[PDB]
Swiss-Prot record, chain A:
The keyword Transcription applies. WD repeats lie at residues 67-107. Present with 33100 molecules/cell in log phase SD medium. GO terms for biological process: maturation of SSU-rRNA; maturation of SSU-rRNA from tricistronic rRNA transcript (SSU-rRNA, 5.8S rRNA, LSU-rRNA); positive regulation of transcription by RNA polymerase I. The keyword Ribonucleoprotein applies. Involved in nucleolar processing of pre-18S ribosomal RNA. Required for optimal pre-ribosomal RNA transcription by RNA polymerase I together with a subset of U3 proteins required for transcription (t-UTPs). Belongs to the UTP5 family. GO terms for cellular component: nucleolus; nucleoplasm; rDNA heterochromatin; small-subunit processome; t-UTP complex. Signal peptide: none annotated. It is found in: Nucleus, Nucleolus. This is U3 small nucleolar RNA-associated protein 5.
From Swiss-Prot, chain B:
It comes from Saccharomyces cerevisiae (strain ATCC 204508 / S288c) (Baker's yeast). This is NET1-associated nuclear protein 1. Interacts with snoRNA U3. Interacts with MPP10. Component of the ribosomal small subunit (SSU) processome composed of at least 40 protein subunits and snoRNA U3. In the absence of snoRNA3, forms a complex with other t-UTPs. This complex can associate with pre-18S ribosomal RNAs. It comes from the Eukaryota. The gene is NAN1. Involved in nucleolar processing of pre-18S ribosomal RNA. Required for optimal pre-ribosomal RNA transcription by RNA polymerase I together with a subset of U3 proteins required for transcription (t-UTPs). Keywords: Nucleus, Repeat, Ribonucleoprotein, Ribosome biogenesis, rRNA processing, Transcription, WD repeat.
UniProtKB/Swiss-Prot annotation, chain C:
It comes from the Eukaryota. This is U3 small nucleolar RNA-associated protein 8. The lineage of its organism: Eukaryota, Fungi, Dikarya, Ascomycota, Saccharomycotina. Involved in nucleolar processing of pre-18S ribosomal RNA. Also has a role in nuclear tRNA export. It acts between the steps of tRNA maturation/aminoacylation and its subsequent translocation out of the nucleus. Required for optimal pre-ribosomal RNA transcription by RNA polymerase I together with a subset of U3 proteins required for transcription (t-UTPs). It is found in: Nucleus, Nucleolus. Its main location: nucleus. GO terms for molecular function: tRNA binding; U3 snoRNA binding. Interacts with snoRNA U3. Interacts with MPP10 and UTP25. Component of the ribosomal small subunit (SSU) processome composed of at least 40 protein subunits and snoRNA U3. In the absence of snoRNA3, forms a complex with other t-UTPs. This complex can associate with pre-18S ribosomal RNAs. GO terms for biological process: maturation of SSU-rRNA; maturation of SSU-rRNA from tricistronic rRNA transcript (SSU-rRNA, 5.8S rRNA, LSU-rRNA); positive regulation of transcription by RNA polymerase I; tRNA export from nucleus. Present with 16800 molecules/cell in log phase SD medium. It comes from Saccharomyces cerevisiae (strain ATCC 204508 / S288c). GO terms for cellular component: 90S preribosome; nucleolus; rDNA heterochromatin; small-subunit processome; t-UTP complex.
UniProtKB/Swiss-Prot annotation, chain D:
Interacts with snoRNA U3. Interacts with MPP10. Component of the ribosomal small subunit (SSU) processome composed of at least 40 protein subunits and snoRNA U3. In the absence of snoRNA3, forms a complex with other t-UTPs. This complex can associate with pre-18S ribosomal RNAs. This is U3 small nucleolar RNA-associated protein 15. The gene is UTP15. WD repeats lie at residues 36-77, 78-117, 123-161, 165-205, 209-246, 249-293. InterPro entries: U3_snoRNA-assocProt_15_C, WD40/YVTN_repeat-like_dom_sf, WD40_repeat_CS, WD40_repeat_dom_sf, WD40_rpt. SMART domains: WD40 (SM00320). It comes from Saccharomyces cerevisiae (strain ATCC 204508 / S288c) (Baker's yeast).
RNA sequence: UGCGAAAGCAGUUGAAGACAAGUGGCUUGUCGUUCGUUAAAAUGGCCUCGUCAAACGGUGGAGAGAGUCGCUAGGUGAUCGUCAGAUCUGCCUAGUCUCUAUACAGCGUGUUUAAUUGACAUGGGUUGAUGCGUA
């Protein structure tokens, strides 16, 4: 090609990222589903993770997360964050799970030393969901 | 390269600190002194000196120069034919010039050229001369309107004239002024036809014997340049689209050449058979300077044989009687048919009266191969200064920069501005930051995008590859005031530190595992005040970072990335409130650091934790630079000192359009002014190349530097076989 | 250039050992050791010893005795080894070697015949160097470095008995000519205030620096370029800096002339014969952040005033960018004399202090930028008005409008005049957030709440607000929520800050439901006026009329 | 002059859980085959040499499948009890099978009728039989006799070495892949013993205490070996006798392992693990045995294998389940007068001094929207956006190119009811996504700015505007509640 | 236009002269005219140099598509009916379940961290659109 011809712009396979991925630093309760959820999260079992969080009764979700062990509430929250990042219609039903994980395990993940670095994907997903709120405010006006 | 300032032979013609209207106006190939014997050129300047210069071998140390007996006239051009020589001159009502043609002779006393005065034209609007130089056309403004007159100059073969209302259509008199304004004209080597290019976009070939016209409509914006071929059967035209068209005048058939990195402000055929086209490309994405690229190209395959260009910086403001060229609408890249006079009056008044006379730019030096990278608008000119020719040119944003010649409305769109770029200290990566602007008259027209890109090349290839880009670093709509590359001790010189106008900092670094440049460290404060008077510095050890926000120089560490702390409280002063917002925090070496703010210039030691020296800046740099540009005005070294740099706009007996530069150096914490230099022109950027020199960029872009039997048979055979 | 300053034989062991340091003793029989226990046998003792070392075995120990030779000891087992005499004059500083590293038969008198670490292995006779008063052993390529008071430097390598280099080093009577921490140099201290580093590969000075103050017992630490130095008649062992992977914190070197300062670690209490107390407990020299602490060996501050770029035909200054003036006529002598003109009998009046300050600094009396000023000068005139004399109407208005006020601002709540207090809220450019939060939560229910919330938001980071607004009671925050709900943008985000910083659980319910209802209607009105701001042909048959 | 820059497809910031190269490669193992066996598939080995066939050990038969048709080419049915192990020799020439009566029978592969020799091992069931990987003429059989045996296949009467020492149920052998004297055996008491065969052989030289009862031990390097048993697997440096990684990423016991090297893959090595709960997972030995991909199967997976390192054809992952069936997932791969007349067209300049090259490279074909943006047909470019078969990022990038480049209004000028309905009917779908909704916002804003009268006239885009209103209502409830979650974890810092 | 932060905060928009049109003046409008102020349109758009097919290597994906009326949560309709509720085995959406050449998109394989080969005489002539129906 010519020597005076400028180089065109080409991204190629450059990784486009945002500025918000901080990935670097007797019974009497119900019949819940938390053994299913716990041995979904001990492995990486997307299939039975989907069969445990297609349950959407609020008291079942509530005491399920209450009976959950708090050392893996952070990875339940990571799985929920990645699923609502990918599928956008899940944000309605699945963020009921993410608000209950914060309310119940409000001590474990305030005692964790790097909250944003450990659940970066939630922060990036909610930042990109709520960043454009003035724009669709102007749109619906 | 015949350097003018190399010798007093013709630097005595011009070395002035105030007067650069002495200009070089024509070059001829022969020798006007003695005929019939050529390997040397005779240059006519715009005042009346005629220098004869040998460009084969070493330049002679006494050229054959003369000075023609001239009136107040100022030398439009000279003309050559067989044997004879003409010259044309300009004059002193409505502001129009006035032209006057002489003929030359030389022979009797070999110091003076005698002149003859053929004729005059008492008001000239526009002019052109044919390719052979045998005839010339021009415009008149003689009443209801203008007029058009063609005249052969080396003979009275033909001289005709007519009002151009007989050229113009009947539709144009009830249409806009662009339809009757004419921005170009050309004649062929016979004077049979003439091309009138109008500001509306059309061209019209009139046939001069009978004044019948033919319209050629392709240019959707103003026609800026026209030329004929030698036989007159092809018309080259160029305009605001960056497309050179050539019209086959038999069938009216265009051949195009579409993406010519600048608008064609002049085009002409060049060879005896017409095998070259020479073009001038105005490159009008920056409105702050008129930077022309000279490009001839062979006519066979239309490839750019020998494109020529100077360095292309973009200054923060317009420079010196710079007028962006004519067009159809008044845009942010051009001006309409009305506003050229008002714009030049306003620009002269702005250079006289106003206060923010800062037109300073950022230039970078690639620390591997010592070539300097002028970031143009949405592009970079990589340019090496040991031969002062451009390495290449590369588009670094995603605009409509290259894909399209923008026209009358579309010139109100701007491609994203590259405002920062810095190399990592081993020269392996190039960090760049750009502001992507939205088009007007829609919902998202008032939120910018801020994009930080990371480029890589090996040491052979001339162009960089984007490895990653982060859109909105630091958050949405927030700028990056300063990026700083990191020293060789953090991630093997593969980290960058970006600063907000919130005082937030982000440390980005390239790790090989996830093979990308990712976000490592973060310190965000959430204030409610913003200021772009942000500066940054790093310790060479890689231990502590000096975050010079406005009025406040915080001291952060690197391990926990918060403000510095020792529990023993050994007068751990980790903030230095100064009298004004600080714009340079340049640390010369690990002992001390020079702060520069808009009143004073302090220096602070850290092995003796207090102020050591101070200087007064307010009488020199008061409210004249934008806050954040003292960092490009002053610089440092790694051993041998620090360089301040001030500017005095000169005065009459009010300020003027003339400038002088006062650069000063200091060694070893502001001790001695061991360099006090004065340069004849405004100075725009100074920076230390990595081998103990400091390069600076003049406002007219001269880069300067502050440093430390058989013999006769052989001769006759090389004659007779060449 | 100091370090963290406090604390007013096998050379690489520590504690949990028995005695890896057996050393000689002043005014005693020969030698001793102690534990935190190994036996103290004899290495053919009772001579004129001045130091004592071992072969890095502690049961092949010795007593380095001034008899031209030395033998082995049995400090663990009971079985001795044989020896062989070389000289008979003075071997008081004998240092037995490792497995063939650095050994020669140099006793005291220029007879450095090379040998090995054995009782009968020999080498060449490398006694060529002159009478050296400072012979040390380093590990460049294990080498005897001789500095001679015939003055000349030489360096022989006891790896092939090869004289590497040598020159004429004019070294006088020294204090400690100790080898460097990386061994590449020689730190030789001059007597009172100086310590020069010389190149110990070519015998030439590389950096001759002065020191801070009096120091006598100086030796290079196990650092990059740092030394330790104890005072002569002082127990003060300070540190200075002119191993790099995971450096030392204690047990670095034992050469000191304090009150029996043997076996000097960081916690240097349990000595080898002394049984003393301990001191500092820091590590060696770091890269560059500890030199902001140890900012010593320079204490020469003067009164730095703003100079000017020197007037070399300054009359061609070419359109100066000021308003009307060109240069302020600097009077630092009048700046100092204004102190005497102010510290007078204007004990309640503004006739001899405020007029004095506004005459010395001809300004608009609320504005900066006609500066020529020093922070010590402003602090001393602020002290002279904080003495016998806030009733001045010009001086203490024009100098909280100065960015160098230096922390005499704490009584700004403790004095309460309305206009001076609001001006010290808005413009005083260094304020303590403790007093700012106290003034914020000591509410007088006015617009100065907005003026104090403005500054507390616009000059402190949010987490530094949160950590120091944890330091509040609960009646303050309950009345703050009550006053916000009663009766704006910066106080909304301040309310966000108080909710983030009160904590998680320990709240009440009625205040929470009241705040919930209030901010529900607040979001509703914010939504509707955001909507308001974002809110800012022919038929087939007609019938018409015309003029008659 | 330059060439024209291509229209860059709008890529947003990347979302979490992107497609890694490892999981793209391991996800193109597809077209699953399910073959119902008579009983649980206990072992599966591959042919080493022409690595293109594999033997599946069901109950009382061993079937060799081909790696190009996936049908049973050959079968071995003349066992008396349940056949347990079946492996090929390192030359791939013959096939050993341990049987529940303790009768090792070795046939030759690809000939089920010629049983070559029947070693009568212990009276207990022989559960693992494999040849040496360096040597050819020795066969190691461990049985439920708590003693393994090395047999020379010439002298098949007494075992040439008898490796005893284990307290319970030796179920696995392994050989160390550079030292051929080194046999690592693994039993149901934990305790990977390993033996130097030049010594006595009744005592291991050392023992590695996997705490769970091991199910398999394989050798990865000449130095490190991996033992699975219980819910985890551990890796052991063998020159230093010392554990250095352990991954417990399963629910139930890891039944088997195998390992791949140097094959055509982004992963330079791969250890896959099969674990009685349905899962088979692949772990990358170069970044610390991190899991990269996995398959879930319809029952507890008892054994697994992949095609060997030099497969050169159709490549296989096979997993045999305890349910009694077998799952295969593969990745696949004019006249002499006229020629004498047109001879030279394949020469390419070998003996020729100068070789000129200015044939330009043929670039990718331009799509219709890209050539219409090139031809400045901006309304036609919008029309080419809203065809049905267009990718969502392609509609987004032509909207963004018309937004940045020229004029939304130019692209929308000559429209009416029938030619706006594609745009708004796509804007319904694009208003949900984050990456599109800014562009959807300003395009809808411009079209209602300059078509507010067609709003009055046509009722059949009024309803489209109403549906768009309820869409922005749902999206604004979502963008408000996301800010509420953002605040409610900003509280927890 | 100035100060600014990317928000915003203060300032506006005169005079002379000439010319054109309309009805020597009067009105209106222009200016390749000057002084002062910090101050939309002339049917008129971008070149050839070789395409097609099949791979391969990284990069993104809202995945490209097809089912099961299988589950979870919903939004809603026709007719009758006092409602209760009936039939339409009511419809639509999202998630889940199942499957495919990851079907989708993009950059590259001339040297690159990586990754490419093959077809074709890259012509001329005659019909080819009034010859066509599966709608």
């Amino acid at each position: 090609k010519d020597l005076a011809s400028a180089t065109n712009y080409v991204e190629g396979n450059a990784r486009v990222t945002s500025g918000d991925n901080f990935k670097h630093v007797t019974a009497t309760t119900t019949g819940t589903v938390t053994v299913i959820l716990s041995q979904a999260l001990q492995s990486n079992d997307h299939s039975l993770l989907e069969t445990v969080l297609n349950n959407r009764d609020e008291r079942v979700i509530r005491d399920t997360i209450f009976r959950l062990k708090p050392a893996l509430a952070v990875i339940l929250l990571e799985r929920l964050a990645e699923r609502i990042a990918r599928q956008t219609h899940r944000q309605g039903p699945l963020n009921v799970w993410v608000k209950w994980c914060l309310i119940i395990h409000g001590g474990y993940l305030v005692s964790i030393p790097n909250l944003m670095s450990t659940l970066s994907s939630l922060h990036s997903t909610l930042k990109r969901r709520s960043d454009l709120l003035p724009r669709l405010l102007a749109l619906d006006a | 390269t015949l350097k003018f300032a190399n010798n007093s032979l013709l630097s005595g013609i011009f070395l002035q600190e105030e007067e650069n209207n002495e200009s070089i106006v024509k070059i001829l190939l022969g020798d006007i002194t003695v005929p019939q014997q050529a390997h040397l050129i005779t240059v006519f300047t715009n005042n009346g000196h005629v220098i004869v210069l040998n460009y084969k071998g070493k330049l002679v140390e006494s050229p054959k120069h003369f000075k023609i007996s001239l009136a107040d006239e100022k030398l439009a051009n000279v003309f050559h034919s067989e044997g004879n020589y003409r010259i044309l001159t300009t004059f002193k009502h409505n502001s129009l010039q006035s032209y006057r043609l002489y003929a030359l002779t030389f022979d009797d006393a070999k110091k003076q050229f005698e002149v003859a005065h053929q004729a005059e034209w008492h008001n000239v609007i526009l002019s052109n001369i044919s390719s052979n130089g045998k005839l010339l056309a021009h415009m008149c403004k003689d009443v209801e309107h203008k007029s058009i007159s063609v005249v052969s100059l080396f003979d009275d073969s033909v001289n005709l004239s007519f009002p151009l209302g007989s050229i113009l259509s009947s539709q144009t008199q009830s249409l806009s002024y662009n339809t009757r304004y004419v921005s170009s004209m050309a004649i062929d080597n016979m004077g049979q036809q003439l091309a009138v290019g109008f500001a509306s976009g059309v061209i019209s070939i009139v046939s001069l014997a009978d004044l019948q016209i033919r319209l050629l409509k392709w240019h959707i914006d103003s026609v800026l340049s026209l030329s004929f071929s030698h036989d007159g059967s092809y018309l080259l035209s160029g305009g605001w689209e960056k497309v050179m068209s050539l019209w086959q005048l038999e069938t009216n058939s265009q051949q195009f050449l579409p993406r010519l990195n600048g608008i064609i402000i002049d085009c002409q055929v060049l060879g005896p058979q017409g095998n070259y086209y020479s073009l001038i490309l105005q490159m009008t994405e920056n409105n702050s300077n008129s930077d022309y690229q000279f490009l001839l190209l062979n006519a066979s395959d239309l490839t750019s044989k020998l494109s020529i260009n100077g360095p292309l910086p973009v200054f923060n403001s317009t420079i010196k009687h710079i007028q962006q060229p004519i067009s159809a609408m008044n845009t942010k890249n051009s001006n309409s048919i009305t506003s050229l006079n008002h714009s030049k009056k306003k620009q002269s008044r702005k250079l006289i009266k106003s206060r923010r006379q800062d037109f300073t730019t950022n230039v970078e030096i690639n620390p591997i191969n010592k070539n300097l990278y002028f970031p143009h608008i949405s592009a970079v000119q990589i340019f090496d200064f040991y031969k002062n020719e451009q390495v290449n040119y590369q588009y670094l944003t995603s605009g409509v920069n290259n894909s399209m010649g923008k026209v009358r409305f579309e010139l109100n769109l701007q491609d994203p501005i590259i405002t920062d770029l810095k190399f990592t200290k081993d020269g392996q990566w190039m960090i760049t930051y750009e502001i992507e602007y939205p088009p007007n008259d829609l919902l998202s027209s008032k939120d910018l995008t801020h994009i930080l890109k990371f480029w890589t090349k090996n040491d052979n290839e001339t162009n960089w590859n984007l490895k990653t880009k982060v859109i909105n670093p630091h958050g949405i709509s927030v700028p990056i005031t300063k990026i700083l590359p990191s020293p060789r001790s953090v991630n093997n010189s593969q980290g960058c530190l970006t600063a907000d106008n919130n005082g937030g900092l982000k440390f980005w670094s390239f790790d090989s595992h996830e093979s990308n440049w990712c976000l490592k460290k973060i310190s965000l404060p959430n204030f409610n005040h913003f200021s772009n008077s942000v500066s940054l510095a790093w310790s060479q050890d890689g231990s502590l970072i000096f975050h010079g926000f406005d009025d406040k120089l915080q001291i952060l560490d690197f391990d926990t990335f918060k403000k510095f702390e020792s529990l023993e409280n050994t007068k751990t002063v980790s903030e230095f409130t100064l009298d004004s917002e600080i714009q340079t925090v340049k640390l010369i070496n690990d002992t001390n650091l020079i702060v520069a703010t808009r009143t004073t210039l302090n220096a602070i030691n850290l092995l003796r934790g207090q102020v050591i020296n101070s200087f007064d800046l307010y009488p020199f740099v008061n409210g004249v630079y934008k806050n954040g540009h003292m960092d490009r005005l002053i610089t440092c070294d790694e051993r041998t000192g620090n360089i301040a740099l001030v500017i005095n706009q000169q005065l009459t007996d009010v300020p003027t359009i003339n400038y002088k530069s006062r650069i000063i150096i200091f060694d070893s914490d502001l001790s001695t002014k061991l360099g006090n230099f004065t340069h004849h022109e405004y100075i725009s950027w100074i920076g230390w190349n990595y081998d103990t020199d400091f390069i600076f960029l003049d406002i007219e872009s001269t880069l300067g530097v502050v440093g430390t039997n058989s013999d006769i048979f052989a001769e006759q055979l090389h004659k007779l076989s060449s | 250039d100091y370090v963290q300053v406090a604390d007013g034989l096998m050379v690489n062991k520590g504690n949990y050992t028995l005695n890896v340091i057996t050393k000689a003793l002043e005014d005693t029989t020969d030698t001793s050791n102690d534990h935190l226990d190994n036996k103290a046998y004899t290495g053919s003792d009772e001579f004129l010893s001045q130091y004592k070392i071992k072969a890095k075995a502690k049961v092949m120990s010795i007593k380095i005795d001034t008899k031209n030779s030395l033998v082995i000891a049995i400090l663990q087992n009971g079985l001795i080894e044989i020896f062989d005499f070389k000289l008979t004059l003075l071997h008081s500083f004998d240092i037995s070697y490792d497995n063939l590293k650095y050994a020669k038969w140099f006793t005291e008198n220029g007879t450095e015949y090379v040998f090995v670490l054995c009782p009968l292995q020999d080498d060449k006779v490398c006694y060529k160097l002159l009478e050296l008063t400072d012979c040390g052993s380093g590990e460049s390529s294990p080498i005897k470095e001789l500095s001679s008071t015939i003055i000349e430097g030489f360096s022989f390598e006891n790896s092939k008995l090869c004289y590497q280099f040598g020159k004429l080093y004019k070294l006088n009577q020294g204090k400690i000519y100790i080898y460097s921490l990386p061994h590449c140099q020689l730190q030789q201290v001059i007597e009172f205030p100086m310590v020069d580093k010389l190149s110990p590969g070519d015998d030439l000075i590389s950096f001759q620096p002065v020191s801070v103050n009096r120091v006598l017992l100086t030796v290079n630490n196990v650092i990059y370029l740092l030394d330790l130095l104890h005072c002569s008649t002082l127990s003060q062992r300070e540190l200075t800096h002119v191993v790099i992977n995971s450096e030392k914190s204690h047990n670095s070197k034992t050469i000191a002339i304090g009150i029996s300062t043997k076996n000097g670690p960081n916690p240097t209490s349990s000595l080898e014969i002394i049984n003393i107390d301990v001191g500092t407990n820091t590590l060696k020299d770091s890269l560059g952040k500890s030199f902001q602490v140890g900012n010593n060996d320079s204490s020469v501050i003067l009164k730095p005033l703003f100079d000017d770029k020197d007037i070399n035909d300054k009359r061609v200054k070419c359109n100066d960018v000021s308003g009307d003036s060109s240069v302020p006529v600097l009077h630092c002598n009048e700046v100092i004399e204004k102190l005497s003109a102010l510290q007078d009998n204007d004990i309640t009046s503004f006739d001899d202090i405020f007029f004095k300050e506004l005459k010395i600094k001809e300004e608009h009396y609320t504005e900066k930028d006609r500066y020529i000023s020093d922070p010590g000068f402003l602090n001393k005139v602020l002290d002279l008005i904080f003495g016998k004399f806030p009733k001045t109407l010009t001086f203490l208005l024009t100098h909280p409008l100065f960015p160098l006020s230096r922390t005499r601002n704490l009584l700004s709540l403790l004095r309460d005049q309305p206009r001076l207090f609001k001006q010290a809220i808005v413009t005083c450019p260094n304020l303590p957030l403790n007093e700012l939060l106290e003034e914020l939560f000591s509410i007088r229910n006015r617009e100065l709440l907005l003026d104090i919330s403005f500054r507390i938001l616009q000059d402190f980071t949010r987490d530094s607000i949160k950590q120091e607004m944890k330091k509040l009671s609960k009646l303050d925050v309950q009345n703050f929520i009550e006053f916000i709900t009663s009766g704006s943008t910066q106080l909304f985000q301040l309310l966000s800050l108080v909710l983030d910083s009160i904590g998680l659980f320990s709240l009440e319910g009625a205040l929470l439901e009241n705040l919930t209802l209030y901010i529900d209607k607040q979001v509703e009105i914010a939504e509707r006026n955001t909507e308001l701001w974002n809110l800012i042909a022919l038929p087939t048959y007609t019938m018409e009329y015309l003029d008659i | 002059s330059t060439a024209r820059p291509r229209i860059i497809t709008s890529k947003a910031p990347l979302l979490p859980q992107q497609t890694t190269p490892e999981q793209r490669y391991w996800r193109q193992y597809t077209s699953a085959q399910l073959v119902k066996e008579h009983n649980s598939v206990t072992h599966i080995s591959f042919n080493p040499q022409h690595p293109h066939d594999f033997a599946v050990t069901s109950s009382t038969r061993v079937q060799i499948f081909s790696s190009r048709t996936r049908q049973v080419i050959k079968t071995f049915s003349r066992f008396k009890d349940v056949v347990y192990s079946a492996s090929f020799r390192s030359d791939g020439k013959l096939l050993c099978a341990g049987d529940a009566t303790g009768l090792v029978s070795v046939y030759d592969s690809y000939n089920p009728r010629t049983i070559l020799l029947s070693i009568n091992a212990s009276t207990h069931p022989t559960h693992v039989t494999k040849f040496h990987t360096q040597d050819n003429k020795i066969l190691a059989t461990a049985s439920d006799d708590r003693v393994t045996r090395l047999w020379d296949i010439s002298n098949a009467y007494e075992p040439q070495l008898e490796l005893t020492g284990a307290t319970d149920y030796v179920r696995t052998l392994s050989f160390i892949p550079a030292a051929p004297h080194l046999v690592a055996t693994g039993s149901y008491d934990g305790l990977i013993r390993l033996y130097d065969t030049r010594s006595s052989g009744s005592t291991p030289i050392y023992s590695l205490n996997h705490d769970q009862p091991v199910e398999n031990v394989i050798a990865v390097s000449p130095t490190q070996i991996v033992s699975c048993g219980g819910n985890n697997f551990k890796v052991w440096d063998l020159t230093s006798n010392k554990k250095l990684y352990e991954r417990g990423n399963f629910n139930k016991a890891v039944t088997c392992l195998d390992y791949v090297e140097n094959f055509d893959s982004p992963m330079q090595s791969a250890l896959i693990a099969s674990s009685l709960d349905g899962h088979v997972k692949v772990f990358d030995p170069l970044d610390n045995f991190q899991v990269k991909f996995g398959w879930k199967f319809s029952g507890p997976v008892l054994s697994c294998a992949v095609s060997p390192s030099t497969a050169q054809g159709n490549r296989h992952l096979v997993a045999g389940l305890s349910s009694g069936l077998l799952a295969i997932r593969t990745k696949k791969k004019k006249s002499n007068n006229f020629q004498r007349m047109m001879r030279g067209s394949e020469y390419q300049g070998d003996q020729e001094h100068i070789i000129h090259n200015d044939k330009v490279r043929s670039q990718r074909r331009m799509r219709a929207f890209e050539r219409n943006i090139n031809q400045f047909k901006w309304s036609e470019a919008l029309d080419n956006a809203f065809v049905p078969g267009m990718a969502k990022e392609l509609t987004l990038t032509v909207l963004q190119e018309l937004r940045k480049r020229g004029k939304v209004r130019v692209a929308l000028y000559g429209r009416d009811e029938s030619t706006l309905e594609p745009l708004l009917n796509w804007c319904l779908k694009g208003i949900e996504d984050v990456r599109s909704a800014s562009i959807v916002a300003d395009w809808v804003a411009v079209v209602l700015e300059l078509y507010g009268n067609t709003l009055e006239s046509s009722p059949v885009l009024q309803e489209l505007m109403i549906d768009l209103k309820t869409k922005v209502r749902h999206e604004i409830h979502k963008s408000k509640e996301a800010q509420r979650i953002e605040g409610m974890l900003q509280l927890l810092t």
